[PDB]
């Protein structure tokens, strides 16, 4: 079942979200938000700066003062509040799935059935840690009682992309609030307005204010400021891997902030010839061209052994052609618009250089529309490893197809990256599957399946895909800071 | 390599040990132990009796008091008396792998290459915990701080039995003494000698008096008086599921005692259809075999796919022709004697019963020597799961073989047992190993492999096969008690 | 901040629940439930015996089939639907904190205000560990990838009290249901209805039949049935030592089923010359009184330090004095009437032994109405530690007091004891808090507190208290099965 | 008991370790090392250069590849490695602890048995981790399997400081090694001899070349070279806030390596009016004077409670000028030289700077010796927030006394600092003691005690004092990099 969508959502908040109150821009500023299916202004969204972020950042440190509400607060009382966030987006769904859909382009099926089934869970997940990160009682030697607090690492910078918007913005509120931290959070310019709902609920919800403040706007100018903030204790930035790096350096050179960064990838996703057909090429369809191509682990190196290579290759011919490419509103619909004119350029610049590089256009190549921003799913056969298309994330609907003969080489070829973000291997062999999982150098490997995520199951990069993990029990580790208490006793005994 | 043993060792322990002193009975009465390859005893043993067992445990409550040295010592020097009783026992390696095959009957380069490395590891492995079970900080609701100590469960009543003797020992000393207990051992009397030299070692390195005692004699007598005893705060008993419930009435019936208990099983060794044959058959005739098939582990229900049952019985008669039963001093020699009259009676008997309810014989079924408890190694094939051989521990060279048809038929045949001590599965395909891997009812299930023990991973029964867990973090579980200490405070704050 | 009572609730359920089903006994038999406030029938219920009992078992193991709907369940929709049953009973709050007052003569503002708050906060805190318990990859030795599972343990016998009907409830459905075990559940004949009407609640959240079945009947009869099953794989007993004894004799007389046990008290809380004495009055009232005095962890020796004896003394009698004892439905209320005749008989047979055995009676000691199972608020002073009300455990409102001179002397008292169930500390110094803190032989140690139960803090026995523990990360424990699968891989890297 | 030390120990490496093998640097050049308590040359040490760095890089790298002997190398075996070094250090501690107080300063009885038994203990305990760090099997929605690995990083550099030279090398070999990863690291050009003694002993002790690699030589040149290399996976330094800039900065600028960082503290020290009044004094003396003040977290802030400020103030005074200042190798010298001239010069200048700012000069306050760099034990009264040596890091024997009146007032001037590595709290009241360890922020407070180090215990800095923690398992995180592997499974059950 999923609700009829209203397709022409009222927008209710557009402005900056400061101790649950909403406010202009200092500047009065605003920019204009783009509806990617159709080229046109949804509305208008004040454009925060550095001194908006500012009046955030010193509004988040108040409500982590020593005594304040929501440092007394009951630990398991977080998780009450949670768990009355997730009770009130679940109220708003229909509504939040169609405005996810009008402002990011991904079909209202998805966002309903995905996007917001995924927050639902995501937040209640987090929920439930509120109170069981347990610090230690530790036997040191000596005549001691050592122990550990798990505190909250403090002021929290968050900055989200705009690929699954109302998703990203839970992987951060879910790990920092179930551990009391308070945050600054920077939603994407292309897509703030389902956050900035989001946080009406925070309130509705009954969190303090200062918990969790807003800033909508760019990033070199509102990204930044947090970044090189002098008291926010902690960014968690997940975007490319160029502005990864811009943050680290930032970390350095203000306050020596800890860090945490969740970038792009090139993954490869390895048929082995014994694999499942029908269900290898499904899912390899899957991996690449989910949400119009533009996640972060897409399967964006399909190796195929090379015995299965040519029906393999036709079948996923057959597949790209038959996705259904329109309006994302219409149930038919598999994929909308690219997010924006930028990205929409940027796609059809890299189908151009593996045509020019001489990747065999095999279906798809152009534009799939006039107004808007749509792309034709397009699939690049015989692709080579020094290939600029195999080695450079695309973010949209453009599939690499490799072949490879042996289990020994295609781990050389795919771990042959400055990415690692996931892998995936498909096979029916047990110690093939065990080989490739131990081998590749991947934050996540899938067998036999693509794009799972649980919220129980951590989630980041090797190399230049990232440093930390999101989701699980990991997620929670960067968001604490540790103080170890040791005590003079009169007589230790075991 | 293995170092020539000395086939004729000399005992210099053989009384009872008790605050890091040799004793004789009360009594002083004495019991035989026999060298089970020539039927000659050994040497008299001091026969403990419960005057004996009361004796130890004042000598071990006396060692446990608040402010002893015991109890004051630093974990992590726990830790260290540790790795210096391993360095005692591989300095005396060829001496007690010697001993244990005199006592035993198991060959001599598998004492020294197998149980003793395993000693050595178990020991090793433990003595790493000493300073690792961390107790919890907790965040309680309300202004209080709450933690927990995780402290000693006591005086252990620790009772192992003859099939390992030195490797029972171990992985009853390595979790009781890591966490701080104080333990009153009781030995088999099949094998009481190799256990009593480790004691002397145990003096050698520095344990305080009173930390480990140990009490050869009889079940009946100085077990009960253990499992009965109202200052003994927990038992530990490996044996069979007989005497396993004695144990637990004894408990119930004194003190409450917390109990532990590894007991036998009839454990479905399960090979498909695509497994590799030649590593099957091996690890199939290993998996019955090892340790003259005195192990409670045992695969000794051998269930084969029927397209590959005819070549799997034709290849295991073979092998099992082919082992070589022999004085445990010969290099060559696999198969030792049983270890006692009792048991070589008990196995001679459940073959009798294999012959008479029709399962076919395909080799061995006797005797193996004129002198010495030796028995051939015996393989009945078309074994039927209503037969007594099928469902009864035989805990001898006794091997059964069942055919099969389908994977969901033999989930339901293999776990149609009281037992469920553990199971493996042979086979090459992924989803095959993950489906019976999850749906076997068995503490331990082995893929590919059998008898695969690591110091790091738990081993124990489901069913009737014992409760709690040896081994790994987890066998520091039941020789721990927790305290929770929930101190008000003037204001929590996260 | 109470709402008013309904002070005659309707009962809607007095049957026995098997499969979301309200059944009679088989053999038709009922038996009467008293309110104890009037000694007053309230209501029939079903009388279930051994062969209720066994279509419970049945149903449960049914329910616990691998791929039935409760086994294949994702361990999140666990934590959904416990978190669903939290709701059901907070909807209800009004009503069964009323229902619970009827039969079992708490004070309704105290079933409102604390029990029904406990139920509702320890099941919202299991519903956060459903999908959290992890099993661990472990680093074995050899080409091997080795891993737990934690499975559930199965078939879970429960049978609790009748002093926190609702509240024992929770403890034994939370942490059962969060790991995804199927129960059988016995509950206190004084006290079965709110047990009851929370069954009609469990299917109204949409558990699956067979997960949960409620047996009401008497101990001999239905708790012994549990005990006994050759079908029940693990039970959880919370009661007497002695009834304790009887279960544990079960467990191993039939199946040997894993056993913990929640048992009685003389929990010691010791008050120093250095303590606020306000504050250690008050609380010392309360850890005595609480309940009726019918609390395991009762402060029911509270040992005062010899230069505050006097003015300790007096304060205390003033407090007793002026406890009010009455209709449990009037606000001013703050003692009821024991839970039955037999309860009340045997507490005013201590009093009369306290008198008899020379403990200075300085209030109460008498009955303090003429229906209904009322005792006035009884003191005693130079109490002696040899005396009958010193060593056994009362449960009703009966206070002892004891000097004592030094802290060493009083370590040593307090632990003179066969019980360890709770104990408390009243002083301003940090080093005698951690040097009682760490001596005193029990479970919980409160340090300026007293019965400050915590769903997140773990609870339960030293000695003959009881074995395992409630609450807290340790809860799951018991509730858990642990396998370890071990699997050949082609080459182990670390 | 102490051995007597070679006062002129000779020197047998003194070159660049890689491979296990010996090299001159690639430019032949080398650098002088000082005995600074006679500003003798002792001898030359290759210098280490950005050539250097990348051949040990380049063989951490080989040493780490799949397949090779550590990558292949049991956890377990990881451990033994881990105690056969700690072993070896024991072996030669009277040497290494003699070479330690030529090179260093620092007194040879401390060196002897505070140093090396740190040292031996670090090992030993990380040695205990190696086998059992594990990753987790998780309980995600839907039909997978889902687990993780905890594998090593990968190329760890290290840098580390001149105060602590053989413990620091511990506190960083221990946890890399234990957990499987490979080590390039830097030295001080001040202390780089016993480092290079111990890379002897890890050849000895049988780590696979190329596992663990020393570059003598600088910070700019050597050390920077590590932080940017584009193959070092992970960093870790130690050393000052402003070089853990430059460090942080050159992982953005480079390739996103993950960052630890250990740097300085102005740690506050609060003595309450209850304190015990000489622990108090004698523990304060200790915390700024220990190590010559050469320590990260010495207490450089000693507020003491106005009641007793002036018989505190005596008594320090007191014991200050009783402290032996002298030839490290003295038994009767408590106090060596500072490492080098600079820091002789520096710390002369803090000292200045404090009589020049109006701080109470109470005694010492310069040179002690006319060779070597001998600094008299120097105590400055009444001492206030604003001045320069309340402020800056002197890493000198330079004690600051300041007056406080109320606990609030003292958790705020101690709170106000941009530092946050240590505090301690002196009092006998429990909860001063409680709301004091909650309210400081700082990574470890110690209460009635000071620099209490245990390897079980985390350490490591708030603020501008570093992020992440070493020691305890805490010190394992930055050293694994975690992997979720998903399968897709016939049918998840519980
Ligand atoms: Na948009
Ligand atoms: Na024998
Ligand atoms: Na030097």
């Known amino acids: 079942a999923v609700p009829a969508p209203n397709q022409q959502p009222e927008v209710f908040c557009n ?13 009065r500023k605003t920019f204009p938000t783009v509806n990617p299916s159709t080229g046109e202004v949804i509305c208008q969204v004040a454009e925060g700066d550095k001194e908006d972020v500012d009046k955030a950042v010193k509004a988040a440190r108040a409500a982590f ?3 304040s509400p929501w440092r007394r607060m009951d630990a398991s009382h977080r998780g009450r509040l949670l768990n009355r966030l997730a009770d009130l987006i679940e109220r ?26 995924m927050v639902l869970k995501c937040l209640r997940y987090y929920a439930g840690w509120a109170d069981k ?7 040191i030697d000596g005549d001691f009682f050592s122990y550990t607090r798990h505190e909250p ?29 308070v945050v600054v959070m920077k939603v994407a310019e292309q897509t703030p307005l389902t956050a900035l709902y989001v946080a009406n609920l925070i309130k509705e919800a009954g969190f ?40 680290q350096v930032a970390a350095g050179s203000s306050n020596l902030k800890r860090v945490t960064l969740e970038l792009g990838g090139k993954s490869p996703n390895i048929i082995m010839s014994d694999a499942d057909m029908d269900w290898a090429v499904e899912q390899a369809h899957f991996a690449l061209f989910f949400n119009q191509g533009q ?26 052609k038959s996705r259904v490419v329109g309006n994302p509103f219409d149930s038919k619909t598999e994929q909308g618009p690219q997010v924006d004119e930028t990205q929409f350029k940027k796609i059809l610049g890299y189908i151009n250089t593996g045509k020019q590089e001489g990747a065999k256009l095999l279906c798809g190549g152009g ?32 599939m690499q197809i490799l072949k490879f003969k042996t289990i020994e080489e295609v781990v050389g070829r795919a771990n042959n990256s400055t990415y690692g973000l996931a892998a995936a291997v498909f096979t029916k062999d047990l110690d093939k599957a065990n080989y490739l999982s131990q081998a590749l150098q991947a934050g996540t490997v899938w067998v036999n399946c693509y794009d799972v995520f649980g919220a129980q199951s951590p989630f980041g990069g090797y190399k230049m895909s990232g440093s930390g993990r999101e989701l699980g029990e990991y997620g929670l580790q960067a968001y604490t800071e540790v103080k170890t208490v040791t005590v003079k006793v009169p007589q230790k005994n075991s």
């Not at 792309?375 to 994330?393: C, L, S, Y």
């Open 15 to 27: 402005q900056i979200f400061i101790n649950n109150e909403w406010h202009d821009a200092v500047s």
């Open 65 to 67: 003062q020593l005594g």
């Open 92 to 117: 708003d769904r229909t509504y939040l799935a169609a405005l996810e859909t009008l402002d990011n382009g991904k079909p209202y099926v998805i966002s309903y059935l995905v996007d917001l089934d």
């Open 133 to 139: 990160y347990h610090g230690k009682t530790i036997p």
């Open 153 to 181: 690492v403090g002021v929290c910078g968050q900055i989200i992309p705009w690929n699954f918007p109302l998703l990203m913005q839970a992987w951060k509120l879910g790990p920092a609030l179930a551990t009391g931290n």
């Open 208 to 247: 303090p204010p200062g918990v969790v403040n807003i800033v909508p706007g760019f990033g070199p100018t509102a990204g930044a400021a947090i970044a090189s903030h002098e008291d926010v204790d902690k960014v968690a930035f997940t975007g490319s891997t160029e502005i990864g790096r811009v943050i």
């Open 295 to 320: 996640c972060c682990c897409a399967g964006s190196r399909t190796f195929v052994q090379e015995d299965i290579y040519d029906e393999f290759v036709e079948r996923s011919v057959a597949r790209a």
């Open 367 to 398: 534009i799939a529309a006039d107004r808007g921003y749509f792309i034709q799913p397009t699939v690049f056969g015989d692709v080579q490893d020094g290939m600029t298309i195999a080695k450079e994330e695309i973010f949209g609907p453009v």
